[PDB]
């Protein structure tokens, strides 16, 4: 016992005779000879073995046509192995053939772990699918683990190892028709930014601006980026570029700055630094700039301050006044925060000499300066002699 004898010739029928047209019409037979004769709930596994070796012609090479057109897709859905899917979309839910075919698939994916990202490709490529993705949902249900996200991530990772051109092609449709299982967590992001070249990164960046792709929501994003500080230089770099495309305000992610260490987060710091420049500084943004501790090597805080104060002398001075006074009142951490803020200001002052602009000589700073002198011992007052004594007059 092995194959079914009334079927043994059908196993090798289309093994040679291979012209696309006389293949799909010589395939509809195999569909309907499982309905009439039930073929158990176990005979499903034997047909999977002799079709895996049958369609090796297909899995190697490319899955995508050269020219990106609807008929170019239709040419690749016309391909023999893509008929099964055509059947599965036309059917109905309560129909017991909906699960029967599904269990043939859920067994064929089990042997060949690449039917998954094919399934995704079909459901976009073919217009017999009608865009509907519920068929992939049905598939991931059937799969032993039963989870859609876990399944999706397996398929995409397979695709990202096999045909990156396809992974880039699909990425808009995946993030669109499955927002819940995609947007929140950036494993799918990490997958993409680990294979995409400069052309593809642009390809994707345009989709975002066309509004044809969303890879982040404002609630999900800051978490993803936190996770990005681990990735490879260019993955991180690619991630920020995709973020910058999205138009979420920099305020949403400004807390990330607490997580950014000089000696180890340069890609992340660079991008953020070069973005912070073009921003009307909110109070919180100032607060975070000031919150990073003073290393003599870390030039980032004085970079961003010098730049902000050119463009926004007073608005900034206000912010420094508020926070200064706010921490003046509030002690152990208050004095450490105050000291750190004072130190930062001193670095800026020892820097700003190279310009004859006036930031440090305006009232809202001056006010806040002498005011916060009160709550100081000689340990501080003598260190920042120059800074304080710059505000002698009142």
Partner 1 sequence: PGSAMAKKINDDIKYQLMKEVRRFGQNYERIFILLEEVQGSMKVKRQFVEFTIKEAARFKKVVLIQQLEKALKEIDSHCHLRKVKH
> Is there binding between residue 357 and a second copy (CB under 8 A)?
no
Distance between CA atoms of residues 125 and 98, nearest Å: 21
Stretch of residues binding partner 1 (CB under 8 A), selected from 8-16, 33-41, 111-119, 228-236: 228-236
Q: State both tokens at 342.
A: 């004072």
> Could you give the 3-state DSSP secondary structure of residue 310?
helix
Nearest CB to partner 1, comparing residues 127 and 259: 259
> Is there binding between residue 38 and a second copy (CB under 8 A)?
no
> Is there binding between residue 336 and a second copy (CB under 8 A)?
no
Distance between CA atoms of residues 321 and 248, nearest Å: 28
> Is there binding between residue 302 and a second copy (CB under 8 A)?
yes
> Is there binding between residue 251 and a second copy (CB under 8 A)?
no
Is the torsion defined by CA of 44, 49, 51, 56 positive or negative?
Answer: positive
Stretch of residues binding a second copy (CB under 8 A), selected from 12-20, 80-88, 210-218, 333-341: 210-218
One residue of 196, 245, 253, 269 binding partner 1 per CB under 8 A: 196
Nearest CB to a second copy, comparing residues 355 and 363: 355
Cβ-contact 287, 308 below 8 angstroms: no
One residue of 205, 226, 229, 387 binding a second copy per CB under 8 A: 205
> Is there binding between residue 176 and a second copy (CB under 8 A)?
no
Nearest CB to a second copy, comparing residues 106 and 236: 236
Cβ-contact 135, 85 below 8 angstroms: yes
DSSP state, 184?
A: S
One residue of 198, 333, 379, 393 binding a second copy per CB under 8 A: 198
Distance between CA atoms of residues 302 and 308, nearest Å: 10
Q: How far is the CB of 311 from a second copy (least distance, A)?
A: 9
> Is there binding between residue 351 and a second copy (CB under 8 A)?
yes
The residue count for the chain: 394
Mutual angle of helices 115-125 and 148-162, in 10-degree steps: 90
- Binders of partner 1 among residues 291 to 350 (CB under 8 A) are none
Contacts of 345 (CB under 8 A, 6+ apart): 320, 387
One residue of 167, 188, 239, 245 binding a second copy per CB under 8 A: 245
> Is there binding between residue 64 and partner 1 (CB under 8 A)?
no
Distance spanning both ends of the chain, measured CA to CA: 103
Stretch of residues binding a second copy (CB under 8 A), selected from 43-51, 121-129, 186-194, 242-250: 242-250
Contacts of 262 (CB under 8 A, 6+ apart): 269, 295, 297, 298, 300
* Residue 194 binds: one of a second copy, partner 1, none (C-beta under 5 to 8 A by kind): partner 1
Q: How far is the CB of 251 from a second copy (least distance, A)?
A: 15
> Is there binding between residue 240 and partner 1 (CB under 8 A)?
no
Distance between CA atoms of residues 160 and 320, nearest Å: 48
CB-CB neighbours of 95 under 10 Å: 10
One residue of 15, 18, 150, 355 binding a second copy per CB under 8 A: 355
Name residue, tokens 């006044």.
Answer: 321
- Binders of partner 1 among residues 145 to 184 (CB under 8 A) are 164
One residue of 25, 37, 197, 284 binding partner 1 per CB under 8 A: 197
Contacts of 347 (CB under 8 A, 6+ apart): 294, 301, 302
Distance between CA atoms of residues 171 and 44, nearest Å: 33
* Residue 56 binds: one of a second copy, partner 1, none (C-beta under 5 to 8 A by kind): none
Stretch of residues binding partner 1 (CB under 8 A), selected from 25-33, 172-180, 189-197, 341-349: 189-197
Cα 349 to the center of its chain, rounded Å: 40
One residue of 24, 50, 158, 195 binding partner 1 per CB under 8 A: 195
Secondary structure string (H, E, C) spanning 281-298: CCHHHHHHHHHCCCCCCC
Binding site for a second copy (CB under 8 A): 68, 197-203, 205-207, 209-212, 233-234, 237, 241, 244-245, 247, 263, 266-267, 269-270, 273-274, 277-278, 297, 299-300, 302-304, 306-307, 351, 354-355
């Amino acid at each position: 016992d092995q194959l079914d004898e009334s079927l043994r010739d059908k196993v090798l029928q289309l093994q040679k005779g291979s012209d696309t047209e006389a293949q799909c019409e010589v395939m509809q037979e195999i569909v309907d000879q499982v309905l009439e004769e039930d073929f158990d709930s176990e005979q499903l596994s034997v047909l999977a073995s002799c079709l895996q070796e049958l369609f090796k012609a297909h899995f190697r090479g490319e899955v995508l046509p050269e020219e990106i057109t609807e008929e170019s897709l239709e040419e690749s859905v016309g391909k023999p192995l893509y008929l099964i899917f055509r059947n599965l979309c036309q059917m109905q839910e309560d129909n017991s053939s909906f699960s029967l075919l599904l269990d043939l698939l859920s067994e064929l994916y089990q042997k060949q772990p690449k039917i998954g990202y094919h399934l995704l490709y079909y459901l976009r490529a073919s217009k017999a699918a009608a865009g509907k993705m519920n068929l992939y949902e049905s598939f991931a249900q059937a799969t032993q683990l039963g989870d859609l996200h876990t399944c999706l991530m397996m398929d995409m990772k397979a695709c990202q190892e096999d045909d990156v051109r396809l992974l880039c092609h699909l990425t808009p449709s995946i993030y669109t028709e499955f927002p819940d299982e995609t947007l929140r967590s950036g494993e799918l992001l990490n997958m993409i930014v680990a294979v995409i070249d400069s052309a593809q990164l642009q390809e994707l960046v345009c989709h975002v601006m066309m509004g044809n792709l969303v890879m982040f929501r404002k609630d999900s994003v800051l978490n993803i980026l936190i996770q990005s500080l681990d990735w490879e230089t260019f993955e991180q770099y690619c991630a920020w570029q995709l973020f910058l495309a999205h138009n979420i305000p920099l305020e949403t992610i400004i807390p990330i700055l607490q997580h950014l260490k000089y000696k180890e987060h340069p890609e992340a710091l660079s991008c953020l630094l070069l973005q912070l420049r073009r921003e009307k500084p909110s109070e919180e943004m100032v607060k975070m700039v000031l919150s990073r501790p003073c290393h003599p090597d870390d030039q980032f805080t004085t970079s961003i301050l010098r730049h902000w104060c050119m463009k926004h002398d007073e608005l900034l001075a206000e912010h420094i006044k508020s926070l200064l006074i706010k921490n003046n009142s509030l002690s152990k951490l208050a004095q450490l925060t105050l000291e750190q803020i004072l130190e930062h200001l001193d670095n800026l002052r020892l820097n700003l000499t190279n310009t004859k602009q006036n930031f440090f000589s305006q009232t809202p700073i001056l006010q806040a300066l002498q005011h916060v002198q009160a709550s100081c011992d000689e340990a501080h007052k003598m260190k920042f002699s120059d800074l304080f004594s710059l505000a002698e007059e009142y």
